[PDB]
């Protein structure tokens, strides 16, 4: 058996971490491309998928914050905040 967990390296290069530390809640780079999915950086951004419609970029910070930003409600997965699809 060979062990894969070659590891991810910041799009800035600036550190190198298994990929248990990509989306693990936690900033471990200082561009925040290890945390596309939380609201873990300070400086990064979300990605508004927005499925047949035209896809935007949030703020981290307005991932679970309880708010619906993207018109696809994805941004508000564990927050309590129900958001509807609202891209049409
Ligand atoms: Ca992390
Ligand atoms: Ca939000």
Do not use: M, W
């Not at 936690?26 to 300070?42: F, H, I, L, Q, V």
């Not at 970029?57 to 708010?67: K, P």
């Amino acid at each position: 058996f060979y062990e894969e967990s070659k590891p991810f390296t910041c799009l800035d290069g600036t550190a190198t971490i298994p990929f248990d530390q990509v989306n693990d809640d936690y900033c471990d780079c200082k561009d925040g491309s290890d945390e596309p999915g939380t609201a873990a950086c300070p400086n990064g951004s979300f990605h508004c998928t927005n499925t047949g419609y035209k896809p935007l970029y949030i703020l981290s910070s307005r991932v679970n914050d309880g708010v619906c930003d993207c018109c696809d409600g994805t941004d508000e997965y564990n927050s309590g905040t129900v958001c509807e699809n609202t891209c049409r």
